[PDB]
Write a protein that binds this ligand. Structure first.
Ligand SMILES: [Mg+2]
Ligand SMILES: [Zn+2]
Ligand SMILES: [Zn+2]
Ligand SMILES: [Zn+2]
Lengths: 112, 539, 81, 171, 142, 262, 97, 131
RNA sequence: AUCGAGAGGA
DNA sequence: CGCTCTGCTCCTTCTCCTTCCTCTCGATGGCTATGAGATCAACTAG
DNA sequence: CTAGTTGATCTCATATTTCATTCCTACTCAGGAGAAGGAGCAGAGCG
């Protein structure tokens, strides 16, 4: 129910200004804030204190403190995030990079 | 050379002191960074990153260009506390049996049994700390929950545990019957913690052990991390870290000196604190307590933490967002006679930005003409790259009329018409404010945009500026021309509405034009019809 | 798992963009062109022509979140964009 | 010594070779960096068992450029030394302080420090063989050596041979 | 061990003699592939011919490798080589030990134990004495 | 701050929405799996109007005189009148609409009958009329049976999820539950014969177009939905706002707590 | 010019993965380093003139890989190195399927 | 002149409208103190404008000083900002020859054209009164 | 060159 | 009913905290020495 | 191949000891909200 109330609440703020934003964009935001069975804020004490990739979490507002915790706990990062591939200068697994391209030898050799 | 791979995962951890000793290529012993031009082998020696023109870099050659640094080594006379782990160190000692090597609690208590069942390592010991911190005794015999009359002889020490309080860079243990905890004793007890106890505490036996939280040997960052300095006329003006490392070296040398000779016990105690203080601030010069390190010039010393913390650090200021090349910035003006996806680019700007087109049978004839023109005329190139990478400069050679192109070569072609490019208005608030435009070269010094495309940018011709970014590869070109192309963002997902339209005088002009009272003579009509580029020639 | 592939049969815009970019990049490297030449010197026009007649010899590997993947031939993918 | 194992190799192919001929051209490529190769894990790779039935497992296009990458698998024959291994090999060249002897595909340096002290260098012999004792070792004569470890090098793999032992003498 | 085909294959300690047999087989296989596209003296030259046409002769070491292996080959006739396979492998010997016995010349168990440290502490001397005599006579047949 | 929280939320090829960890956030993007750029406000007729107004616009009876279909509308006139087989289909259709009418009331308590939905059906129909100048003054060649089966056939091809399992199939029906209710409203038997005097050639073209139009509007997997949503929320904030700062931050000690008791 | 955070955020919305990588590596900071397979550390002695590689402390001369990363990233690791942290980089995912 | 940009009479510029000068004085010092430090500027062996004045002098410490002033003429150009006395700032959208401009009966030709749409949204009725 | 501060513009 | 216990609430401490671009000015960057004795190496020639 | 002589280069005690080793903080000036740990208290169970 709080998820519905949160949506009904933020909708008022945006609607009050006279601007209109689609249902999806507001719906996604409240859903992310309540996947943990609770209102996870977007502050350093909210979203940041999550289990997401350690390297991605460092860059938001707390960096040196975060690295120590990851280093002390021997945290392993899977590099499945966006920032990780940005830091390491690789193609992020998003958009055009969410898949892979293979050479079809069977079709290529077939097409003579 | 070696196989090429891409990083799949990152594993964090702490250096094992033996690992630090092994990785290093030189032992640092002298605070001196210099005599006249030679460099002392005890610091910044050739075994680290050599200075330019010196292809040594511990036999890596390559100068500073293609050779990274190689780490040094320092062996502290007395171990010191790592600053970042002070809080965790306090937490850990609050749970270990304090010179018995075990945990204060044990599986025989139901409360912690649930804590041990917690899958999250970070939350695991947090729950444990809430329990063991309150236990002030590690009695050998603990009654069993299943059998109250039966006790388990676990606690080797069986004595009480002091209340541990943080005081500056040191911890004080108030025994319930009061002294400063000794750094050495922490290593002993931590070394006595069983591997099984690591897991309950969230550590990793091969990447993070409690004893490694105490520094016994300092890794020495190589010169590139603290680049050799030439701000002034042969004046060193070296980086702060070099000065700070020398300061620690001075302290470290003194500490062993006092202990080795004379042994003025009390003087050794303060000497250790100075070593602890200098090392502590060297990594983080921002602590809760008063102590703030000040450079000889009078400004605070910029520890490593400052180089990373906050904006302008290595992460936000140099990794997430960074200075880029192949870009231009100038003022914008309107042009009704310019299509949406098109944009006017100054010849001067177009004459400097380049694109490395590959020589192929389809364009070897055309590219040759551009080379013949040279970098002076607009439709030309600046550099020609051979197969081996010999970056020919057309500016400083008459060979522009002599060079012969070969398939596989790259030509730094000038930006020409219809080349996809990316605009950007600061701030880039939302998606519509970064779109890919086609190029038309305009003979003036300002970007020319269509009017109807100003709305998505939130732009205005009152003196605004736009940044221009040019892709350097065919694949990047395709995505700009297939994803960021202006016509593809006509409908904005923001509000389901077309983010663009007819605005300003054109919007007002149509209203007058389409009134029921407006009529057009024959002479006027013919001119209007011709202005339509898609007209079929039928009146 | 070629049997009962649960992904869409259409050609995702991102897939179209990346396939066109990769094919144009290969063409710029003097790769064997599989379609007749109509004077389109630019590699990207050749790539679009190749995609129009399903003459691109490539297969996409769509990755599902768990780590599995599905191989879709560029020929079978339905281009509706 | 000699073993058979299923090895894997990653091969990068330039786009220009994307003709149908690639199917066999890639196989051809395999040969020039599998035939007679050097490695510290398997020793020397001599030949590829099951030359046909080449494993390709589909090519992956590097996102950087058009060059493709194939993780070819193949059964291969390798030769690997072991500590204390006795081998009957031949002598290639003599030396002042020992011999150089060929053990199949690998080289073994039979040093003077590890032959019996009664066996001494004879400068007057042609070739300069060791003939002061019964263990007459020369280029044209066979030899039996013991491998006291293998000091493998990046470019090649060579071991140390000894005759200061009861068995595995000259010839 | 496990191969790259998904099969748990044991360490194939290939004997020197059977190693020569399989290299010959692979060479003839390559020869047919291009077509589409026993005393030591005879074997040494015949295999040298095989190597000299399958390749360009640049890899001289392999010819030096292959030639001397024939010179020291102890079981050249593949038909009789089959005997020493089941004779050695069927006894439960370690494959490396089987390769050790099938590539060198030995006659008595004590010599095998001294030459092979692994067998010196766990081998049944009776089996070694019986087989080594048999292989010793078999070796002379070549 | 808002972007970093939603930076790594992407639509995966399974059509769900996940973050970097793989945690599921929305089992279907936006609860319908439709790209925002292909949506637009459309009117749901079955919601508004009085019961009689709804009845006279949709109810068709081949037996009684209240809802008699005019024979002049169709080439087949009295042949349809009195046909019980066709009458059963109309009763099922009318009952189907009746369920939708009372169903949508629960979904939209306020009764608002203008909501964003994919595929502007009205525009397609108008294009169909002008496409080949359908003559609106002659009987049509369509049949009641063809209209009913054709519409039902269309609902089967509106595939947002491709899995053959019960869970996917159950979700698939839910995804297009609102959109199909719009189809049955504007493709009703009476409307397609009286208001929209289409022909056999038109009707087949219209249905085939809706399917193509609908599928093209499906959200493309790989879309970076997370950033796209955060930017959309943030940008109007540049134009109440302290309250927004009070929402993103939990701010338990709010400024103006209030209750609305009915 | 600076390719700020919002500048990359817009491209992430566009999904242009290749362009974003190009803006951050080819445009600037492109750098090649060698990594020990045993330890994900940039402590490989690469005598490239002689094709000789080594990792003192691991005695590894066979397991080396090249990785292209921003020069700024190399610093970030090396400053973490000096801070007693070990950002070990591995080119093989622990979990396959 | 759709947005705040404006159309300007090219021939008006040629006759001297909004012409401007621009001075930019450079500086350099002789050397540091005398403890084995010296440097001079006597043409050692191996912006856009003219030199206005080269001033050679010495500070109170006896060090030779050189101040060079270079002037240049900056003519109005497309994109150069202009503004009235009411916050109506804008840039030269384009320049037209005199013949192309609209002209009154008397032959007076405008020196500057600005967009009507700037008036209502900005509510600069004071600007109209001044005109 | 460096940091440091100030002014100003988008 | 007094002892003791423990959670529970309460009430301090105690941190730790915010687009893009162009100019100008200005303080400071700064090391510690003397050569000379004695050791290594560079050149040279038989 | 190698001893010799002399350029070059590493390491140290000789000279200057001079003249006192700066000060005392002042000042207000922003700041707010959340997290941590001590402290008290009181009823609940126990002796
Ligand atoms: Mg403006
Ligand atoms: Zn180096
Ligand atoms: Zn203890
Ligand atoms: Zn290593």
């Amino acid at each position: 129910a709080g998820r519905a109330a949160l949506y009904k609440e933020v909708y008022n703020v945006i609607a009050s200004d006279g601007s209109y934003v689609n249902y999806r964009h507001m719906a996604l935001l409240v859903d992310v804030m309540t996947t943990q069975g609770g209102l996870t804020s977007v502050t350093r004490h909210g979203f940041n204190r999550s289990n997401t990739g350690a390297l991605m979490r460092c860059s938001f507002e707390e960096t040196v403190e975060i690295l120590f915790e990851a280093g002390a706990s021997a945290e392993l990062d899977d590099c499945r995030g966006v920032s990780e591939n940005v830091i390491l200068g690789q193609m992020a697994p998003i958009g055009t990079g969410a898949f892979d391209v293979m050479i079809d030898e069977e079709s290529l050799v077939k097409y003579m | 050379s070696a196989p090429l791979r891409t990083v799949k995962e990152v594993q964090f951890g702490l250096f094992s002191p033996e690992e630090v000793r092994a990785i290093s290529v030189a032992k640092i012993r002298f605070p001196e960074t210099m005599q006249t031009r030679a460099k002392i082998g005890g610091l910044n020696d050739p075994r680290l990153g050599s200075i330019d023109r010196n292809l040594k870099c511990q036999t890596c050659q390559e100068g500073m260009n293609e050779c990274p640094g190689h780490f040094g080594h320092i062996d502290l006379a007395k171990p010191v506390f790592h600053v970042g782990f002070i809080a965790k160190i306090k937490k850990v000692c609050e749970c270990v049996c304090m010179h018995c090597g075990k945990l204060l609690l044990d599986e025989h208590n139901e409360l912690m049994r649930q804590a041990l069942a917690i899958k999250d390592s970070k939350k695991r010991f947090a729950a444990i700390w809430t329990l063991c911190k309150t236990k002030m005794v590690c009695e050998t015999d603990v009654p069993s929950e299943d059998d109250p009359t039966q006790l388990v002889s676990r606690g080797g020490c069986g004595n009480t545990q002091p209340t541990i309080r943080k005081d500056g860079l040191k911890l004080v243990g108030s025994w319930k019957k009061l002294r400063v905890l000794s750094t050495e004793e922490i290593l002993n007890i931590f070394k006595h913690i069983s591997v099984k106890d690591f897991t309950s505490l969230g550590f990793n036996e091969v990447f993070s052990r409690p004893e490694w939280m105490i520094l016994t040997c300092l890794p020495v960052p190589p010169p590139p991390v603290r680049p050799s300095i030439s701000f002034n006329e042969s004046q060193r003006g070296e980086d702060d870290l070099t000065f700070k490392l020398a300061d620690i070296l001075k302290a470290n040398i003194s500490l062993e000196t006092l202990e080795h000779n004379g042994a003025p016990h009390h003087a050794i105690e303060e000497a250790e604190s100075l070593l602890q203080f200098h090392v502590a601030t060297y990594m983080d010069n921002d602590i809760a307590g008063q102590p703030q390190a000040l450079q000889k010039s009078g400004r605070p010393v910029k520890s490593i933490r400052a180089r990373l913390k906050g904006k302008e650090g290595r992460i936000r200021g140099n990794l997430m967002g960074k200075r880029v090349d192949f870009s231009a910035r100038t003022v914008i003006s309107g042009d009704p006679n310019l299509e949406l996806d098109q944009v006017g680019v100054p010849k001067s700007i177009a004459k400097t930005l380049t694109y490395p087109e590959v020589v192929t049978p389809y364009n070897i004839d055309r590219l040759t003409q551009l080379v013949r023109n040279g970098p002076n005329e607009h439709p030309g190139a600046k550099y020609v790259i051979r197969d081996s990478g010999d970056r020919i400069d057309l500016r400083y050679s008459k060979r522009a009329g002599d060079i012969q192109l070969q398939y596989g070569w790259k030509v730094e072609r000038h930006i020409m018409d219809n080349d996809p490019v990316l605009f950007n208005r600061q701030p880039s608030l939302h998606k519509m404010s970064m779109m890919a435009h086609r190029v038309k070269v305009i003979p003036y010094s300002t970007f020319r945009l269509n009017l109807s495309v100003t709305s998505p940018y939130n732009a205005d011709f009152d003196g605004d500026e736009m940044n221009l970014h040019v892709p350097q590869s065919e694949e990047t070109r395709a995505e700009l021309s297939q994803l960021c192309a202006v016509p593809l963002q006509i409908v904005s997902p923001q509000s389901n509405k077309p983010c663009m339209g007819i605005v300003q005088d054109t919007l007002c002009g149509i209203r007058k034009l389409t009134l029921r009272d407006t009529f057009i003579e024959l002479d006027q009509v013919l001119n209007m019809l011709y202005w339509v580029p898609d007209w079929d020639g039928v009146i | 798992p070629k049997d009962q592939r649960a992904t869409t049969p259409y050609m995702t815009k991102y897939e179209r963009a990346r396939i066109l970019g990769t094919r144009a990049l290969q063409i710029s490297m003097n790769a064997p062109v599989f379609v007749d030449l109509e004077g389109e010197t630019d590699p990207l026009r050749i790539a679009m022509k190749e995609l129009a007649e399903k003459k691109i010899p490539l297969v996409i590997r769509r990755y599902l979140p768990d780590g599995s993947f599905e191989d879709w031939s560029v020929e079978e993918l339905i281009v509706d964009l | 010594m000699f073993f058979i194992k299923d090895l894997s190799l990653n091969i990068t192919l330039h786009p220009s070779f994307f003709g149908p001929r690639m199917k066999q051209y890639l196989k051809t490529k395999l040969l020039e960096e599998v035939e007679g190769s050097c490695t510290g894990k398997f020793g020397y790779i001599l030949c590829v068992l099951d030359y046909d039935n080449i494993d390709i497992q589909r090519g992956r296009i590097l996102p950087t450029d058009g060059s493709a990458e194939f993780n070819v698998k193949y059964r291969a024959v390798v030769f690997k030394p072991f500590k204390g291994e006795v081998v009957d090999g031949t002598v290639v060249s003599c030396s002042q302080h020992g011999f150089e002897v060929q053990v199949g595909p690998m080289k073994v340096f039979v040093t003077k420090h590890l032959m019996p002290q009664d066996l001494t260098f004879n400068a007057g012999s042609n070739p300069p063989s060791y003939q002061s004792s019964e263990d007459v070792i020369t280029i044209k004569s066979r030899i039996r050596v013991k491998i006291e470890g293998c000091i493998s090098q990046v470019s090649s793999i060579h071991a140390i041979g000894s005759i200061k032992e009861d068995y595995l003498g000259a010839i | 061990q496990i191969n790259h085909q998904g099969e748990e294959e044991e360490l194939i300690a290939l004997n020197l003699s059977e190693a020569r047999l399989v290299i010959k087989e692979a060479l003839v296989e390559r020869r047919r592939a291009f077509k589409r596209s026993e005393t030591r003296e005879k074997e040494l030259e015949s295999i040298d011919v095989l190597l000299e046409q399958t390749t360009g002769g640049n890899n001289k070491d392999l010819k030096n490798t292959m030639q001397y292996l024939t010179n020291f080959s102890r079981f050249r006739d593949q038909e009789t080589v089959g005997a020493v396979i089941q004779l050695l492998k069927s006894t439960g010997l370690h494959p490396f030990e089987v390769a050790q016995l099938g590539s060198l010349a030995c006659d008595t168990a004590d010599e095998a134990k001294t030459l092979i440290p692994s067998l010196n502490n766990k081998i049944s001397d009776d089996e070694l004495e019986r087989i080594l005599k048999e292989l010793s006579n078999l070796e002379t047949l070549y | 701050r808002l972007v970093k929280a939603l930076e790594d939320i992407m639509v995966h090829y399974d059509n769900t929405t996940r973050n970097s960890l793989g945690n599921v956030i929305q089992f279907i993007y936006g609860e319908d799996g439709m790209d925002a750029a292909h949506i637009e406000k459309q009117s749901l007729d079955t919601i508004g109007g009085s019961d009689a107004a709804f009845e006279k616009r949709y109810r068709v009876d081949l037996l009684n005189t209240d809802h008699t279909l005019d024979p002049s509308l169709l080439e087949s006139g009295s042949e349809i009148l009195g046909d019980l087989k066709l009458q059963v289909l109309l009763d099922e259709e009318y009952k189907q609409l009746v369920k939708d009418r009372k169903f949508l009331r629960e979904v939209f308590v306020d009764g608002e009958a203008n909501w964003p939905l994919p595929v502007n059906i009205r525009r397609i129909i108008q294009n169909a009329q002008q496409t080949f100048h359908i003559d609106h003054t002659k009987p049509s060649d369509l049949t009641i049976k063809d209209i009913v089966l054709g519409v039902k056939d269309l609902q089967e091809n509106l595939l947002v999820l491709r899995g053959k399992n019960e869970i996917i199939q159950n979700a698939q029906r839910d995804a297009v539950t609102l959109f199909c209710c719009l189809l049955r409203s504007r493709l009703a038997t009476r409307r397609v014969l009286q208001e929209y005097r289409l022909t056999k050639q038109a009707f087949d073209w219209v249905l085939s177009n809706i399917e193509a139009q609908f599928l093209r509007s499906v959200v493309h997997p790989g879309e970076m939905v997370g950033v796209l949503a955060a930017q959309s929320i943030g940008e109007p904030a540049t134009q109440g706002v302290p309250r927004l700062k009070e929402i993103l931050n939990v701010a338990k000690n709010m400024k103006t707590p209030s209750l609305t008791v009915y | 010019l600076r390719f700020g955070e919002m500048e990359r955020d817009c491209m992430i919305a566009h999904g242009a993965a290749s362009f974003l990588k190009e803006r951050l590596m080819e445009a600037s900071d492109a750098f090649r380093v060698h990594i020990c397979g045993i330890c994900g550390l940039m402590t490989v002695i690469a005598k490239l003139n002689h094709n000789q590689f080594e990792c003192k402390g691991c005695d590894n001369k066979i397991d080396i890989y090249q990785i292209h990363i921003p020069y700024a990233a190399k610093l970030l690791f090396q400053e973490l190195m000096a801070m007693n942290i070990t950002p070990r980089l591995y080119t093989d995912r622990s979990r396959d399927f | 002149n759709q947005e705040d940009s404006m159309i300007m009479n090219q021939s008006s510029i040629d006759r001297g409208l909004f012409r401007s000068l621009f001075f930019r004085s450079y500086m350099d010092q002789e050397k540091k103190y005398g403890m084995s430090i010296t440097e001079t500027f006597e043409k050692p062996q191996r912006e856009n404008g003219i030199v206005d004045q080269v001033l050679v002098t010495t500070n109170q410490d006896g060090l030779k000083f050189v101040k060079v002033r270079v002037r240049t003429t900056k003519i109005p150009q497309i994109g150069d900002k202009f503004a009235s006395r009411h916050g109506q700032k804008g840039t030269i959208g384009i320049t037209y020859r005199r013949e192309d401009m609209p002209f009154t009966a008397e032959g007076i030709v405008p020196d500057l054209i600005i967009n009507p749409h700037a008036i209502p949204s900005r509510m600069t009725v004071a600007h109209l009164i001044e005109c």
